Amino acid sequence: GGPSVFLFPPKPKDTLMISRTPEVTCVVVDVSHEDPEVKFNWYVDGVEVHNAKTKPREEQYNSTYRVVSVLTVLHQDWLNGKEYKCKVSNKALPAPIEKTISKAKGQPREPQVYTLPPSREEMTKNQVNLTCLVKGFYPSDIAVEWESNGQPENNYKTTPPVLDSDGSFFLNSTLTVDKSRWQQGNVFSCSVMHEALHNHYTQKSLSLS
């Protein structure tokens, strides 16, 4: 004795993109070789659901199994604050273990998005940094990408959301492009996906005129 349960929320980009699959993951550790069977029961706002997929158990190096149940959440249900409950049953458990999860509960706040052209010190060089400042958003769940002429620009680094003095979040996204591309006057756009924006999406464009 005995097993432990950990419940994980979906990835932010999965929650914000219609083509992606947002999943809540119920992980059971310390499952015995003697009694390796785990019964998973799932509830959405107290209502039982039967659409979760279990994965084949894995032997840990500490000679125990790690057993996982993955529940697909509806994009709208997750955003509307529905509660996801995982109930775990196992013979080595006198009473089942339950864990509940839902989206962060504070008041949603819309991100403010600003673009920063390369600084004269930054601009003289071979490759230039284009910056997208995203601040004042809540919850921290967000997705920031770059684009030009309808195609993704992949040479970017986005900082993790940082908790600010007023309890909201902020981050920077920096795209590195060849100076020649920026200098030419090509339009680079910063894409921001967040629940509180109108239509959960905004974009800010940056170009040298």
Ligand X SMILES: *[C@@H]1O[C@H](CO)[C@@H](O[C@@H]2O[C@H](CO)[C@@H](O[C@@H]3O[C@H](CO[C@H]4O[C@H](CO)[C@@H](O)[C@H](O)[C@@H]4O[C@@H]4O[C@H](CO)[C@@H](O)[C@H](O)[C@H]4NC(C)=O)[C@@H](O)[C@H](O[C@H]4O[C@H](CO)[C@@H](O)[C@H](O)[C@@H]4O[C@@H]4O[C@H](CO)[C@@H](O)[C@H](O)[C@H]4NC(C)=O)[C@@H]3O)[C@H](O)[C@H]2NC(C)=O)[C@H](O)[C@H]1NC(C)=O
Give 32 or 127: the residue with its C-beta nearer to ligand NAG.
Answer: 127
Among 62, 76, 107, 154, binds ligand X (CB under 6 A): 62
Q: Which of 137, 132, 134 is nearest to 115 (CA)?
A: 132
Residue 16 · residue 141 · CB < 8 Å: yes
Among 13, 66, 87, 179, binds ligand X (CB under 6 A): 66
Q: How far is the CB of 159 from ligand NAG (least distance, A)?
A: 8
Interface with ligand X: number of residues (CB under 6 A): 11
Q: Tokens standing for 100?
A: 């509940």
Which stretch of DSSP H or E encloses residue 29? strand 23-31
88 strand-pairing partners: 40, 97
When asked if residue 97 is in the footprint of ligand X (CB under 6 A), the reply is no
Complete DSSP assignment for 125-186: SSEEEEEEEEEEEBSS--EEEEEETTEE---EEEPPPEE-TTS-EEEEEEEEEEHHHHHTT-
- Give residues in contact with ligand NAG (CB under 6 A): 125, 127, 129, 157, 174, 176
Provide the sign of the torsion angle of the four alpha carbons 103, 105, 106, 108, taken in this order: positive
- Choosing among ligand NAG, ligand X, none, which partner's interface includes residue 127 (Cβ < 5 to 8 Å by kind)? ligand NAG
Give 34 or 121: the residue with its C-beta nearer to ligand NAG.
Answer: 121
Give 55 or 157: the residue with its C-beta nearer to ligand NAG.
Answer: 157
| Contacting ligand X within 1-60 (CB under 6 A) | 4, 6, 8, 25, 27, 29-30, 60
Which stretch of DSSP H or E encloses residue 41? strand 39-44
Give the residue at shortest CB distance from ligand NAG: 129
Which chain residues interact with ligand X by CB under 6 A? Answer: 4, 6, 8, 25, 27, 29-30, 60, 62, 64, 66
